[PDB]
Design a protein around this ligand. Structure first.
Ligand SMILES: Nc1ncnc2c1ncn2[C@@H]1O[C@H](COP(=O)(O)OP(=O)(O)O)[C@@H](O)[C@H]1O
Ligand code: BEF
Ligand SMILES: [Mg+2]
Lengths: 210, 50
């Protein structure tokens, strides 16, 4: 029982799954309460849970593990982590972590992280051997990130003109300057598609604000 | 010879032990779930009773 396995499948699978598990009507709750109650009732049968999520530092000292289902926000299924783990295993904001988890114990309301198994897709043993961000020596972009698909589809033109107008590289600083309703959305979608096709090794993330 | 005199030190030590037995019961019931590599020897002890 992993957190992501309920994190990614749609609400309908959660409905049929909880209706199979003999639940109170889960259709009355939110996605986060759905996963919360299902994980509750699963642990009530005696299973040790595994989970994952991105860490957020709070000013009181402790941290909280969020998911991309809540777009990294506060929710009932967020995994509480003590500040002392953040000390020993050198945690901070942005560290995605997966490992042993349990539901909140007697009187608590948020999941607890027992045992760290993967810190940013790495062994938690080497996670302490990391280099900081501001101590980095920045440079210009040398490696070319080819955006052209080469298949010659109808929309692929909007990518090829990329390779003809403004080249991109790893670590580039790009600003899209355009008035509203000019075609930025389709451009960004083609950018994401071309990157995910031609460069599946680099992680791809997108921000949509308001 | 049959009547013993106790000073402030002995009474203070006695009361310290009375508080220490309460903190001992507390740390014993708290140790029922604590495992390796999950807590420093600081959170299980509270200042309150002693
Ligand atoms: N490559 C394309 N092929 C066909 N239609 C397009 C293409 N790019 C943009 N459009 C048209 O432009 C509109 C895009 O709207 P929208 O995504 O809101 O643009 P913006 O995000 O720039 O406001 C769509 O209605 C679509 O019909
Ligand atoms: F430019 Be639109 F508002 F996406
Ligand atoms: Mg848009």
């Amino acid at each position: 029982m992993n957190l992501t396995e309920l994190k990614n499948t749609p609400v309908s699978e959660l409905i049929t799954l909880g209706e199979n598990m003999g639940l109170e009507n889960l259709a009355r709750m939110r996605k986060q309460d759905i996963i919360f109650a299902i994980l509750k009732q699963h642990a009530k049968s005696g299973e040790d849970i595994f989970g994952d999520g991105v860490l957020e530092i709070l000013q009181d000292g402790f941290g909280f593990l969020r998911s991309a289902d809540s777009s990294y926000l506060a929710g009932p299924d967020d995994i509480y982590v003590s500040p002392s783990q953040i000390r020993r295993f050198n945690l901070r904001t942005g560290d995605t972590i997966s490992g042993k988890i349990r539901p909140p114990k007697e009187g608590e309301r948020y999941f607890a992280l027992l045992k760290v198994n993967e810190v940013n897709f790495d062994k938690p043993e080497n996670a302490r051997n990391k280099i900081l961000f501001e101590n980095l020596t920045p440079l210009h972009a040398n490696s070319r990130l080819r955006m052209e698909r080469g298949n010659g589809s109808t929309e692929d033109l909007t990518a090829r003109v990329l390779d003809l107008a403004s080249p991109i590289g790893r670590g580039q600083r790009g600003l899209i300057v355009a008035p509203p309703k000019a075609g930025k959305t389709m451009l960004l979608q083609n950018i994401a598609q071309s990157i995910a096709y031609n460069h599946p090794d680099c992680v791809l993330m997108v921000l949509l604000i308001d | 010879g049959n009547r013993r005199i106790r000073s402030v030190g002995e009474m203070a030590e006695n009361q310290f032990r009375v508080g220490l037995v309460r903190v001992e019961r507390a740390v014993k019931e708290r140790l029922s779930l604590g495992d390796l590599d999950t807590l420093m020897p600081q959170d299980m002890i509270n200042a309150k009773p002693i």
